[PDB]
Write a protein that binds this ligand. Structure first.
Ligand SMILES: COC(=O)c1cccc(C(=O)Nc2ncnc3nc[nH]c23)c1
Length: 118
């Protein structure tokens, strides 16, 4: 099977608008722009529950520097960010609701872009 047919710089160009769409969500992107800081947020159990943290700044730096070698690796990091927030936070919470808003934006933005890689 063929692997890594796209250049990382091709993935950067194709996928960047889906990431920019998340950054444009105000105020829903604000809890996701920087890594969760458990000390600042007073949630000392965060790293016990969330074993692989992810946030927009980490995704952005990986995409900007061509670290994604397959399109699904980017998609998996975005989903990891969402799934961590839904896992840790109460379904009734503001962060949980804001996560769901971002995931809805991402779903609408990502489907046509993945088709354009077909
Ligand atoms: C620059 O950072 C901020 O301004 C800000 C504002 C409000 C909330 C947060 C924040 O990270 N809250 C979170 N609490 C629990 N779990 C989470 N998962 C993602 N964010 C989570 C950040």
């Amino acid at each position: 099977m063929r692997k890594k047919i796209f250049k990382p710089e091709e993935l950067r160009q194709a996928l960047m608008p889906t990431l920019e769409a998340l950054y444009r969500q105000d105020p829903e992107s604000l809890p996701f722009r920087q890594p969760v800081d458990p000390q600042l947020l007073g949630i000392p159990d965060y790293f016990d529950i969330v074993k692989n943290p992810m946030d927009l700044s980490t995704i952005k730096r990986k995409l900007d520097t061509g670290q994604y070698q397959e399109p699904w690796q980017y998609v998996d990091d975005v989903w990891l960010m969402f799934n961590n927030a839904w896992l840790y936070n109460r379904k009734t919470s503001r962060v949980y609701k804001f996560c769901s808003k971002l995931a809805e934006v991402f779903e609408q933005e990502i489907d046509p872009v993945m088709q354009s890689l077909g």
